[PDB]
Design a protein around this ligand. Structure first.
Ligand SMILES: Nc1nc2c(ncn2[C@@H]2O[C@H](COP(=O)(O)OP(=O)(O)O)[C@@H](O)[C@H]2O)c(=O)[nH]1
Ligand SMILES: Nc1nc2c(ncn2[C@@H]2O[C@H](COP(=O)(O)OP(=O)(O)O)[C@@H](O)[C@H]2O)c(=O)[nH]1
Ligand SMILES: [Ca+2]
Ligand SMILES: [Ca+2]
Ligand SMILES: [Mg+2]
Length: 397
């Protein structure tokens, strides 16, 4: 009994256990045995095997449901029947998941983005619910480990807990869970597809590949000619000098004030932050990318749906950078731009730049500088996030 074979079957069992209760009920048994073969046998002829398990082992059937040990036992009983099941779940002759299963072909045209379609979100909603055993709409570390049992490695670093919404204890909430998949689909779609394969998405939803979960948006250029978009996820690059408050902006989207932010650790620090934002009654995803001050602004880190140029009102040299980067990359750009006067809770000093932030915005047809602070008693104001998303949806309005 090769250890590798048992590992595959255990994962197959875990995937086939769709309600995640520990056993395979007859509904799940019919489904598995249908997709692997052809026709679910007589409901009584099903126990013509379900009692066979009962009279060899005493832990193979629990509450009229086939257990893992029973599942593994039935594998032993057969030994081609096994390889049919294995190949149906995407394994090859070396008991590894095939590249065709994990990495399906999904090529995205330039200036297009990737989102999860409606049914894909539903799968993740179901997935979340099956692993939320205490029913608190949040995934504890133990519940997360349970989820990752069908993963060859841990798919999420502990920095994810500051990229999306979490509860009091810092556990990924229901919306934070969806936000993380939304973010992953956007940035690294082939990683998302690989993870969907691990969850057995294509198998359970009975589709051609994992790529069937991904919606590929149209060219951004067309969105600007038509002057309207159908995208639900927009990316905003957050640019500003060192310690100007960029990270504070990202965590403010997650509803965390400066007090709450101070408890973030070693490698907790994320440079992305995503959450739902409502624009005129329309629910959209806002995707913030923290651009740490570097020697260069590449084409890579200046491409977005809206730019957030942040400066520090307590720093007299901070705004000069915003003006510099703007003239350099976004002055004659189709990309909307918003200037944010961060740390507004601090005393406002004079910016050493020749022109004032107000006059600068007035001169270049920008909105007036938006005052912002994350140092508040409760959750910070989400005003700038609503404005950023609005500008991303409706550029020149
Ligand atoms: N690891 C890493 N550090 C970087 C990178 N780019 C810039 N930094 C450093 O990050 C610091 C500036 O970050 P800052 O602008 O304050 O934004 P923050 O990352 O949110 O703190 C400087 O010490 C940079 O050298 C990068 O790609 N990787
Ligand atoms: N008073 C005040 N301090 C802030 C605010 N936001 C950030 N800070 C402090 O400013 C420093 C830099 O903030 P951070 O978000 O790390 O900036 P970044 O390095 O540019 O991303 C930290 O010491 C923060 O505690 C704010 O709204 N008010
Ligand atoms: Ca079950
Ligand atoms: Ca839970
Ligand atoms: Mg910094």
């Amino acid at each position: 009994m090769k250890p590798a074979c048992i590992k595959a079957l255990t994962r197959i069992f875990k995937i086939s256990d769709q309600d995640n209760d520990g056993t395979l009920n007859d509904a799940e048994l019919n489904f598995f045995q249908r997709i692997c073969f052809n026709t679910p046998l007589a409901p009584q002829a099903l126990e013509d095997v379900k009692n066979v398990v009962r009279k060899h082992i005493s832990d193979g059937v629990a509450d009229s449901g086939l257990t893992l040990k029973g599942f593994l036992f039935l594998h032993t009983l057969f030994i081609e029947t096994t390889w049919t099941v294995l190949r149906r779940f995407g394994y090859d002759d070396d008991l590894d998941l095939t590249p065709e299963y994990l990495f399906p072909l999904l090529k995205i045209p330039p200036d297009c983005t990737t989102e999860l379609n409606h049914h894909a979100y539903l799968f993740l909603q179901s997935t979340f619910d099956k692993h939320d055993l205490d029913r608190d709409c949040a995934l504890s570390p133990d519940e997360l480990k349970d989820l990752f049992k069908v993963f060859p490695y841990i798919p999420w670093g502990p920095d994810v807990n500051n990229t999306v919404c979490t509860n009091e204890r810092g556990w990924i909430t229901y919306q934070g869970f969806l936000s993380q998949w939304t973010l992953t689909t956007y940035l690294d779609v082939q990683r998302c597809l690989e993870y969907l394969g691990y969850l057995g998405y294509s198998i359970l939803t009975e589709q051609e590949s994992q790529a069937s979960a991904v919606t590929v948006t149209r060219d951004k250029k067309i969105d600007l000619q038509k002057k309207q978009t159908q995208r639900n996820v927009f990316r905003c690059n957050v640019i500003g000098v060192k310690n100007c408050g960029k990270s504070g902006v990202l965590q403010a989207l997650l509803g965390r004030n400066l007090m709450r932010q101070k408890k973030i650790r070693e490698d907790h620090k994320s440079y992305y932050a995503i959450n739902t934002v409502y624009v005129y009654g329309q629910e959209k995803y806002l995707l913030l990318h923290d651009i740490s001050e570097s020697e260069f602004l590449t084409e890579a880190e200046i491409i977005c749906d809206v730019v957030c140029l942040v400066y520090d009102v307590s720093n007299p040299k901070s705004f000069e950078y915003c003006a510099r980067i703007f003239k350099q990359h976004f002055m004659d750009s189709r990309i909307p731009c918003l200037i944010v006067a961060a740390k507004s809770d601090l005393h406002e000093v004079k910016q050493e730049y020749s022109i004032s932030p107000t006059d600068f915005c007035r001169k270049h047809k920008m909105p007036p500088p938006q005052a912002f602070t994350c140092n508040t008693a409760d959750a910070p104001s989400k005003d700038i996030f609503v404005k950023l998303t609005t500008m991303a949806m409706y550029p020149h309005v």
